[PDB]
Design a protein around this ligand. Sequence first.
Ligand SMILES: [Mg+2]
Ligand SMILES: [Mg+2]
Ligand SMILES: [Mg+2]
Ligand SMILES: [Mg+2]
Lengths: 209, 210, 208, 208
Amino acid sequence: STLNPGTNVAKLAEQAPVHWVSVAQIENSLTGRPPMAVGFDIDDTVLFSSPGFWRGKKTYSPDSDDYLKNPAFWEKMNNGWDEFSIPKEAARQLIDMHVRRGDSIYFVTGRSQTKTETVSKTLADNFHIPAANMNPVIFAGDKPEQNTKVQWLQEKNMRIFYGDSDNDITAARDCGIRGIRILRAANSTYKPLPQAGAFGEEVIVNSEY
Amino acid sequence: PSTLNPGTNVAKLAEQAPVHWVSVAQIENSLTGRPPMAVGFDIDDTVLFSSPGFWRGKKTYSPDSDDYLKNPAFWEKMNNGWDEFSIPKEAARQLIDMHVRRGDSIYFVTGRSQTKTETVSKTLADNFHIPAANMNPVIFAGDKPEQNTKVQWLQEKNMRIFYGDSDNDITAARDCGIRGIRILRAANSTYKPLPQAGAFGEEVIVNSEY
Amino acid sequence: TLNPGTNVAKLAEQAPVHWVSVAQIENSLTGRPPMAVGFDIDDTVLFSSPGFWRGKKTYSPDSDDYLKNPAFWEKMNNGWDEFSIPKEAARQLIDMHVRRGDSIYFVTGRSQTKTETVSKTLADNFHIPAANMNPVIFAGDKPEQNTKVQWLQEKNMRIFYGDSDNDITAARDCGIRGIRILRAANSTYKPLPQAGAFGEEVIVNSEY
Amino acid sequence: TLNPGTNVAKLAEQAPVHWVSVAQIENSLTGRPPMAVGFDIDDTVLFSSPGFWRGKKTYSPDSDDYLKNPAFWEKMNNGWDEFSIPKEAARQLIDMHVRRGDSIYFVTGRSQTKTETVSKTLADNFHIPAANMNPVIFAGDKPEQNTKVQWLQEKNMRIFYGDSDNDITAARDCGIRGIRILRAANSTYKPLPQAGAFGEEVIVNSEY
Ligand SMILES: [Mg+2]
Ligand SMILES: [Mg+2]
Ligand SMILES: [Mg+2]
Ligand SMILES: [Mg+2]
């Protein structure tokens, strides 16, 4: 645009009409409630997994997103490339809180399903989730050999679902449960960034890292 | 405060307070289907930037303190002409227009002291073009210590929503079990310190400082 | 759309502006002998919108002709600034220059009037010693008055503070240091200017 | 407290930092013939935390001792950068300098290894022309190496870009222009530094 655009105080103080919440406010809203099932999307919600997707694109589809359909990519991505995935501090705070409550934690992902996967171990180890609260990662999809995200949220009776994408939030709305938005990091390779708060949902402050 | 070059970082730049921000459009949308009702507005730093008169009052009657706020002579001047210097807030214009469209009955409940005569009601009706059908003379609730003077009025007029910039405006609404919505107090207001909007978990209107 | 939402890139986005604090300005002048510095008045040291607002409502509700009404200026320059709110940023800047022993000048584009109490209101609100205080200078295109630029050169002002683009370009035209002050969002003089539009230094939190 | 709230003075508060854009940096170089410029690597041109994270988890999960493990560096310098994400801000800067015909140098504090594929990774991801590309320089305190300052002086670099305080001080010690890049909030190298702590220029939106 212009070389020296400058700014003004109206612009400096301008706020988007979003419902921001803190982990502490979420915990307070659960006070007294017995243990329950809660779910988390994985990519850009609990793990900054762009390193692996970046390498996959470079290796299998330098000019496009065809790698997301390449079975070879998914073998690598679900069996070791998450050793390069950086866990999010906001996720750590949320999981620690749910673990203290004794809730059952589920991870639901849209990644393609492979015969073997080490993602579940990576998550339990990185977030130090006790055996009683941990559950194997759930790969949701269209395949007749699997169920959709909405179906899993309902089957496990999850009461809250955390995610960074719009479809994570609409899935929760469709099931009539509490959908909470996590901010996607600016350096994620999954762009454009989504508009957090676009459905009037609660958005966790400072959740980009 | 004592650091010449404090610098900054991106975590700090993107840092957000956990506040429930709302827009006039969202408020309006949340009222769809609701029949006409009574709604209330605080005046100072809510619909009018009235600091000019309070500043002149302080300098005239009590340069070193806030005793002017208890001075009958100050209120006479403030309520009968000094608001000619008070600047209407744009955020208030938008809210008032919206409520007029809904056909709601509008009330102004202020902590200013009541005087024999007052020209504030007319100043408000004129500046915000409020039709006679929606207007109501300003209610001067006064301000007593250890007590919230506004509660009585919100109850008796059956106000369903109350807009205000001070904590006592929000707690008044909470005491009545109605919807209290916060308006940001301008940074150049002489009424300091600025309150912490959202301190009761209430809705706060974006960009409402002007 | 009722819910536009936002994202972290937008939340952390910064305009390329050269921000400075009063402390940094003071530090940049260490060891320098007392000099002459000037300040714009409206929205720089005083939030005078109250008087201009009343003036417009009184003399030209539908336009800005009140700015041409000598009746308005008589009121504005002789008492309506008692309703003007001094700016904290200006207070800090003025105190700093007084401590340095600098010579303070106020240059305004307000219309000149036979008498004025503005100089008094300024010296009183900012506690400016007589030694550093100078009567307000009214500039303009009249034959009996010099323009803003000419006044900066004549007094050899080395720094000029202002909220408007013309305050900064005047400084630029004289080869001196022009420093921008933010105009408050509730000022009636709209639209707000783009502080930093000339690559100049802008004082932080100077909207109040 | 549970509901701390906020106020407009806090919402508009700005730190006194000298922000600049890539366009402004380019403008400031108008007319200057080709020159040498240098870039720090980690968190400046590459978000390399993925490799540093895996190394930490592998060699010293509870400390930074992995930074002195030869086994770590062998893997980090010979392939783990295939997981490093190039920064958009660096891409723009590099494209701008390549267009000017400047010589681009990359100086790193990473431990030197017998071989390295970092140079190849950089040249490929940023499409740097052979005429502007130079092999990565590993600076350090070892007797076989030269310090960062000596390298900047040796190659006569006029500008040095970096995210850490030591990148800026190196430029300051050489009398050249040191420009700060923002370190991403999700970098594993914490705490984040205070960009602008030396009054240096900081590039806007350079965290990605
Ligand atoms: Mg995701
Ligand atoms: Mg009020
Ligand atoms: Mg001005
Ligand atoms: Mg670095």
